[PDB]
Amino acid sequence: FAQTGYAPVNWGPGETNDSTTVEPVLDGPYQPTTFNPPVDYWMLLAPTAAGVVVEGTNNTDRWLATILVEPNVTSETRSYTLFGTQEQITIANASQTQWKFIDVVKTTQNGSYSQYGPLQSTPKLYAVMKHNGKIYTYNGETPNVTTKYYSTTNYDSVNMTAFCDFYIIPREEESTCTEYINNGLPPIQNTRAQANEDIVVSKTSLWKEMQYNRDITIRFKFASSIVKSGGLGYKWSEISFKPANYQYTYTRDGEEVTAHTTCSVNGMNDFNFNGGSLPTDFVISRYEVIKENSYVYVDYWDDSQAFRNMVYVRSLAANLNSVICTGGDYSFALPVGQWPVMTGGAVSLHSAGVTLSTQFTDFVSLNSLRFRFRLTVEEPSFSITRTRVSRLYGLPAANPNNGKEYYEVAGRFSLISLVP
Amino acid sequence: FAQTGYAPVNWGPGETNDSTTVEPVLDGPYQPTTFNPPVDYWMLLAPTAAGVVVEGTNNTDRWLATILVEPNVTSETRSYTLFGTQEQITIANASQTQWKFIDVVKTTQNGSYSQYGPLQSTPKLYAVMKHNGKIYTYNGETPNVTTKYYSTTNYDSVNMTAFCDFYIIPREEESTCTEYINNGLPPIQNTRAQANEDIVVSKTSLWKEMQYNRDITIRFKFASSIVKSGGLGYKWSEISFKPANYQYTYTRDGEEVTAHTTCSVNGMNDFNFNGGSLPTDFVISRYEVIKENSYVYVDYWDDSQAFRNMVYVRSLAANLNSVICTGGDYSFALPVGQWPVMTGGAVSLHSAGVTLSTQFTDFVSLNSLRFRFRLTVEEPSFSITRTRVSRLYGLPAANPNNGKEYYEVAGRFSLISLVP
Q: Which residues of A292-325 are buried (b: 16+ CB within 10 A; e: fewer)?
A: eebbbbbbbbbebebbebbbbbbebbbebeebeb
How many CB atoms are closer than 10 A to CB A337? 10
φ/ψ region of A195 (left if φ > 0, alpha if ψ in -120 to 50, else beta) reads: left
Residue pair A163/A85 in contact by the 8 Å Cβ criterion: no
How close A153 comes to chain B (CA, Å)?
Answer: 32
The span from the CA of B158 to the CA of B136, in Å, is 13
What is the distance in angstroms between the CA of the first residue and the CA of the last residue of chain A?
A: 12
Task: Give me the phi and psi of A156, to 5 degrees please.
Answer: -70, -25
How close A312 comes to chain B (CA, Å)?
Answer: 6
CB neighbours of A362 closer than 8 A, spacing ≥ 6?
A: none
Cα–Cα distances (Å) from A254 to A216, A247, A309, A412, B195, in that order, read 14, 19, 20, 16, 9
Q: Which residues of B193-213 are buried (b: 16+ CB within 10 A; e: fewer)?
A: eeeeeeeeebeebebbbbbbb
Q: Are the Cβ atoms of A19 and B268 closer than 8 angstroms? A: yes
How many CB atoms are closer than 10 A to CB B379? 9
Task: Give me the phi and psi of B388, to 5 degrees please.
Answer: -65, -40
From the list A196, A271, A388, the residue facing B214 with the nearest CB is: A196
Task: Give me the phi and psi of B317, to 5 degrees please.
Answer: -135, 125
Experimental structure resolution, Å: 3.5
Residue pair A89/A113 in contact by the 8 Å Cβ criterion: yes
Q: Are the Cβ atoms of A6 and B355 closer than 8 angstroms? A: no
Residue pair B257/B303 in contact by the 8 Å Cβ criterion: yes
How close B351 comes to chain A (CA, Å)?
Answer: 12
C-alpha closest to that of B400 among B235, B217, B233, B244: B244
- Cis bond leading into A380, ω under 30°? yes
Mutating which of A4, A17, A19, A86 best tests the B interface, going by the most B Cβ atoms within 10 A? Answer: A19
CB neighbours of A111 closer than 8 A, spacing ≥ 6?
A: A63
From the list B31, B193, B200, the residue facing A33 with the nearest CB is: B31
Q: Are the Cβ atoms of B388 and A21 closer than 8 angstroms? A: no
Cα–Cα distances (Å) from B349 to A181, B295, B319, B405, in that order, read 40, 9, 13, 18
CB neighbours of A190 closer than 8 A, spacing ≥ 6?
A: none
The span from the CA of A357 to the CA of B355, in Å, is 7
Residue pair A325/A381 in contact by the 8 Å Cβ criterion: no
Residue pair A363/B367 in contact by the 8 Å Cβ criterion: no
Cα–Cα distances (Å) from B69 to B77, B81, B122, B388, B406, in that order, read 12, 15, 12, 44, 64
How many contacts, defined by CB atoms under 8 Å, are there between A and B?
Answer: 268
Residue pair A10/A316 in contact by the 8 Å Cβ criterion: no
How many CB atoms are closer than 10 A to CB B259? 19
Residue pair B115/B149 in contact by the 8 Å Cβ criterion: no
The alpha-carbon radius of gyration of chain B (Å, integer) is: 32
How close A362 comes to chain B (CA, Å)?
Answer: 7
C-alpha closest to that of B320 among B294, B291, B302, B298: B298
Q: How was this structure determined?
A: cryo-EM
Full set of structural domains in chain A with CATH: 41-182 (2.60.120.200), 204-419 (no CATH)
Q: How do strand A51-57 and strand A161-162 relate by DSSP bridges? A: antiparallel
Q: Are the Cβ atoms of A191 and B360 closer than 8 angstroms? A: no
Mutating which of A196, A393, A415 best tests the B interface, going by the most B Cβ atoms within 10 A? Answer: A196
The alpha-carbon radius of gyration of chain A (Å, integer) is: 32
The span from the CA of B367 to the CA of B15, in Å, is 10
Residue pair A245/A264 in contact by the 8 Å Cβ criterion: no
C-alpha closest to that of A123 among A190, A55, A44: A44
